[PDB]
Design a protein around this ligand. Structure first.
Ligand SMILES: NC(=O)c1ccc[n+]([C@@H]2O[C@H](COP(=O)([O-])OP(=O)(O)OC[C@H]3O[C@@H](n4cnc5c(N)ncnc54)[C@H](O)[C@@H]3O)[C@@H](O)[C@H]2O)c1
Ligand SMILES: NC(=O)c1ccc[n+]([C@@H]2O[C@H](COP(=O)([O-])OP(=O)(O)OC[C@H]3O[C@@H](n4cnc5c(N)ncnc54)[C@H](O)[C@@H]3O)[C@@H](O)[C@H]2O)c1
Ligand SMILES: NC(=O)c1ccc[n+]([C@@H]2O[C@H](COP(=O)([O-])OP(=O)(O)OC[C@H]3O[C@@H](n4cnc5c(N)ncnc54)[C@H](O)[C@@H]3O)[C@@H](O)[C@H]2O)c1
Lengths: 238, 250, 240, 244
């Protein structure tokens, strides 16, 4: 399969977990991949492994909450490549705190900061590059963007906000030929609130979120925009 | 590129339009295809064109509202092939009638009968075959399953019913390894094929809101169906995927 | 409180359960109530109890799946009263069957027949009366109109269909001044578990009065800018 | 009608517009009302008009983006009253910017800051008082929390975030007897003047803008025992917009 053949793909949070798996899967589908993470060492380790397999890949440190660093990366991509075919906003954090605890404030600030504000930073900064290539954006949402589930308030809200960001980015960028979608994973390999309701009675394998991301990023989804696709084993239908 | 390699796919309403395109697209992805349509001659003409191109396909008449005929087809499939890998419930009709008109009743009965009751008939009858193969089901939902849009009451309700049917079939069939999903298209080009049936202004409800400002190509609805029916969707069930140019997000 | 002062309210399935409670609550809010049920003896018993309490009520047998009987009632209402201020489609049934069982077909036909086809029959037939009064409609949906929960396929589908019916009725009847809404209850005190209780935020079954109050609200001028809407009354179930 | 009889109700952004009208409508339903607004003179002016009509009300200046100011108010309410029966998070702002413009950043920050971060600030600070009274919360969401409509990105996102906040606050505060809900207005007469209207009007089935009192009534309903089995819920008050 070559669903992303010769496409330039940027994946944030690519040092481990789903982001690294999405980076590897995009390369397997023919993409050249830019892997970025707050842990630059991890991003470069993942990129060097792809390179060692004959893929075209590079890795860099990037804190998505640093608007100056995001702008620098955006200028760099535009200057070296002239555009960006796919942006995957995968960088995220979570936390543990009930709403009625003082701990909820610091957890809220941290999670909102990365999951929502960082996704806005990278999304807004990469618009010129996405315009030049008529690329598309895939956000990492969550089933927590539709129900509260068992995640902390900052996480639920950040993912509900990403759901809305998908819609309004799609609206504003559609005139420029840019599609914007999201996946909403349930629990993926990377607990009661999810297992009671997941129809498949199993957590997802990382490859099973990779394939829907690649689909949405590909011409198979060329009439799909503003859409959040559950990848959740039936969780939200239960 | 063979997402459905050697898989047996049954498509209803496959004699024309989107159903025929889903059938061809499945074959191009490696599937053996059973095409059925109320017009059996049309289903056979579509199947024969696939056979001439080297694919493996067959066509039959099927009235999805006839439970006896649906059961006969299911028994035939189980007996001849031992199972069914993909069911696509595409057969469907629409209509024009406002809720306050007497005409709304005949339209409602007809549309509910084909779109919802037919989809239930075919889905329920093929469960044994789907269990044997651990196959999956893709329903044809609609943007009208989420909002009223411009469609007649029977159509809106049939597609909202299909959305719920997706969820409860997914729940009850998950222990048998059967995924159940749906696509929710806006207007695609096959629905514009007959000119005299395109009333002036008739697509404004959709065109005024769709973000891409165009009717979808028929192949752009085929590809998401194939995706949902494939192992790329192996962790997706109970899910209804809009394929609508951004209509429902607007 | 007189949220439905002098309004005429028709409640289907009012012989017992939520329909009888909605009928009583509507009368308490000032309404004249027509109570109908396939069990006409129960409908008349509920109506006569309301009459004995000093309210204005009447009861009749009605099978909502019988289009001829539904039309006769709609004609009687238009002739005797000139219009209808509120229609509450509450009549409903349920059943038990998994989708892969042969029994699912009989359950499907029975449940679709009352819950969806019956609601269509009554809704469509009462449009002339609703237009004359600029009345409104409240359907009984369910949390099962949004997720599969633990209900049988025919029930789940019937309630998702009611959700859509709410939307397209609202669209077509808005130009005539008719609002159309629905409540989506969780599990209520009635003929009626873990699938719900593990998820309900309030960790209890709803009281019947707690579905009556939202129905009265939607039927009242408090909801004069609300149409096409389905209001969960579910202790938080759908938000969990 | 006394749906909120003797209940203490705090309304943010109550200096004008919907917040002022919710404050007045709550007082009409028997509530004692605390009105707060970044313009404290306006909040006190609205409170004094209610006091003149025989209701019990007070006004204060409050910037909902100032966490120390919010904490002081929460302390004052808890100390003086021992609890809070209703919190209405109404304070909000909007703005004009498309996502691909540089102006979208400053609009985003400003709108997120009031609409989402302020609603969080007030909601989290008032939890002790809400616990002591088993009060409830009504957020001001929007049809924009469900579809993109015509609003700027920061507004759409802030209201979808409010939608999710309703759900997770309801989950965490249900053990303490606190319901949390929201209304989702469409276009209402007020700052329908810095958006212009046709994105809402094309889809609004009633083909009219909602009157202010038609949003007040559903807010009062959700804040009252009529909604005692309703939590985590976002109620559209939109003329049919989201059903179209
Ligand atoms: N794993 C799941 O079950 C699941 C479910 C739903 C959604 N998601 C979403 O998938 C995405 C990835 O999840 P994961 O399980 O791989 O998480 P993970 O914590 O394993 O990986 C997150 C990655 O993002 C990076 N990161 C954190 N903060 C950053 C910042 N400021 N700038 C740049 N990079 C940063 C981390 O270094 C890490 O490499 C997240 O957005 C998460 O919310 C995951
Ligand atoms: N009780 C709950 O937990 C709950 C939850 C969600 C939704 N609902 C819905 O609320 C409505 C009332 O439920 P309930 O619990 O009071 O049920 P119930 O069975 O106690 O009452 C239903 C009433 O409808 C009548 N009825 C049945 N078939 C009829 C027909 N063909 N014509 C006329 N009347 C008929 C019955 O005789 C009965 O009086 C139903 O639509 C139900 O689906 C109930
Ligand atoms: N989305 C929609 O369709 C829609 C339409 C109208 C109103 N609304 C919502 O209703 C609410 C009220 O709207 P409105 O039309 O009355 O707005 P408005 O501009 O008329 O009034 C808003 C009030 O909030 C106050 N305020 C602003 N920033 C503040 C801060 N940092 N701290 C405290 N107070 C502050 C202002 O002083 C003002 O009095 C808002 O949340 C708004 O988003 C939504």
């Amino acid at each position: 399969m070559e669903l992303l053949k010769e496409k330039l793909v940027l994946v944030t949070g690519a040092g481990r977990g789903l982001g690294a798996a999405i980076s590897s899967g995009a390369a397997e589908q023919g993409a050249r991949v830019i892997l970025v993470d707050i842990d630059g060492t991890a991003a470069k380790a993942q990129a060097d492994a792809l390179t060692a397999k004959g893929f075209v890949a590079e890795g860099h440190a990037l804190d998505v909450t640093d608007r100056d660093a995001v702008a620098a990366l955006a200028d760099d991509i535009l200057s070296r490549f002239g555009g960006l075919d796919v942006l995957v906003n995968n960088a995220g954090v979570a936390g543990r705190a009930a709403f009625d605890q003082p701990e909820a404030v610091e957890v809220w600030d941290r999670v909102i900061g990365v999951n929502l504000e960082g996704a806005f930073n990278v999304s807004h900064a990469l618009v010129p590059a996405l315009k030049a290539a008529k690329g598309n954006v895939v956000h990492l949402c969550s089933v927590a963007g539709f129900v509260s589930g068992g995640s902390t308030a900052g996480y639920v809200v950040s993912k509900g906000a990403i759901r809305s960001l998908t819609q309004v980015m799609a609206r504003d960028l559609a005139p420029h030929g840019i599609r914007v979608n999201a996946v909403a994973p349930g629990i993926m390999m990377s607990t009661d609130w999810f297992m009671n309701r997941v129809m498949m009675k199993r957590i997802g394998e990382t490859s099973e979120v990779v394939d829907p991301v690649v689909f949405l990023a590909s011409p198979m989804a060329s009439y799909i925009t503003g859409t959040i696709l559950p990848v959740d084993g039936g969780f939200l239908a239960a």
